[PDB]
Amino acid sequence: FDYTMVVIFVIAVFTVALGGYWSGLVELENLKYLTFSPLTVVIFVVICCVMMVLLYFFYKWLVYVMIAIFCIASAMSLYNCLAALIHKIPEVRLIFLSGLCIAVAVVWAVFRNEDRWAWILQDILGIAFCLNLIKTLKLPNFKSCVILLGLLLLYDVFFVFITPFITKNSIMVELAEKLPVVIRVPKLIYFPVSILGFGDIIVPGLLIAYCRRFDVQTGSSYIYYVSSTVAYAIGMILTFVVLVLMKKGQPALLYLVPCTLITASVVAWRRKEMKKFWKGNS
Numbered sequence: 677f678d679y680t681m682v683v684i685f686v687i688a689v690f691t692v693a694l695g696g697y698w699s700g701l702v703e704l705e706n707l708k709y710l711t712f713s714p715l716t717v718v719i720f721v722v723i724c725c726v727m728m729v730l731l732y733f734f735y736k737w738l739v740y741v742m743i744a745i746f747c748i749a750s751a752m753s754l755y756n757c758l759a760a761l762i763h764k765i766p767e768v769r770l771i772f773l774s775g776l777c778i779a780v781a782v783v784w785a786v787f788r789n790e791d792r793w794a795w796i797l798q799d800i801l802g803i804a805f806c807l808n809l810i811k812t813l814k815l816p817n818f819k820s821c822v823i824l825l826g827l828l829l830l831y832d833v834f835f836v837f838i839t840p841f842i843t844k845n846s847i848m849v850e851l852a853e854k855l856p857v858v859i860r861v862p863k864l865i866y867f868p869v870s871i872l873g874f875g876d877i878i879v880p881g882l883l884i885a886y887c888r889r890f891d892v893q894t895g896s897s898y899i900y901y902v903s904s905t906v907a908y909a910i911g912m913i914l915t916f917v918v919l920v921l922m923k924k925g926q927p928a929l930l931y932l933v934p935c936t937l938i939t940a941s942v943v944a945w946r947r948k949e950m951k952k953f954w955k956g957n958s
């Protein structure tokens with residue numbers, strides 16, 4: 677047990693409970709986006725696998741390409757999130773916000789080496805990126821949710837567990853000039869860092885976004901969203917316990933997808949609404 681492990685859990689739940697909640701907020705005003713498809717989901721999974729293999733085998737230039745793309749995407753996402761937050765309280769303001777965001781992104785790009793104090797910048801950029809990507813990506817129905825979660829679960833478990841049995845080098849032991857995707861937090865006793873991927877925040881984030889959208893659509897207030905967030909937090913705690921008591925790295929998707937899927941299925945089945953929750957309205 678350590679204080680750092682608490683901080684990662686708070687970040688991984690605050691920015692998923694807010695990413696999911698915010699998704700339903702725009703849904704409310706619509707009733708007054710790149711929707712996925714099962715074939716599209718499979719294509720995205722295959723492209724993710726190919727991208728990961730290319731990252732591992734062509735690392736030298738792929739790291740710089742990923743840093744540049746992540747910097748631009750995170751600057752844009754931070755601008756969008758800050759503009760959305762400021763819009764509520766009563767353009768030159770947009771230009772100033774874009775300038776501040778690009779200044780933060782440039783500072784992060786030029787200060788990626790010092791791990792003493794670049795982790796704050798990387799955490800803020802990652803939280804903004806995850807929030808924006810959860811808001812903008814909408815799933816059509818629970819079938820896509822289940823297919824994507826299961827395919828990612830099998831893919832990630834394979835990549836982390838079966839790869840050591842063949843490759844002489846786990847692939848993720850090299851993937852975490854480090855990769856600009858993983859969230860880095862040093863030991864918060866005096867400042868050896870922890871790592872949490874963006875997938876743990878995004879994929880259950882997409883499921884919670886869909887749950888909140890369904891909440892808004894059907895009429896129920898907070899049932900599915902609260903249930904999914906509670907199960908996601910319990911999954912994070914269980915993953916942390918298993919990681920500490922196993923002394924090895926652990927694929928969290930393994931202790932996240934079953935919990936979230938089971939809780940969503942149970943909460944949908946208790947009300948006899950599985951068919952509607954699975955087909956997708958309209």
Ligand SMILES: CC(C)C[C@H](NC(=O)[C@H](Cc1ccccc1)C[C@@H](O)[C@H](Cc1ccccc1)NC(=O)OC(C)(C)C)C(=O)N[C@@H](Cc1ccccc1)C(N)=O
Binds near residue numbers: 871
């Ligand atoms: C909640 C968290 C604690 C769990 C964390 N596991 C993880 O973060 C998982 C695997 C991983 C990632 C990076 C390094 C190792 C292992 C993340 C893993 O599940 C996802 C899979 C995924 C999901 C959706 C879409 C695409 C991919 N990985 C992912 O999103 O892609 C990258 C690698 C680019 C971040 C972990 O095991 N951390 C260990 C690993 C470690 C890091 C540093 C030193 C020693 C050991 C730790 N003790 O900090």
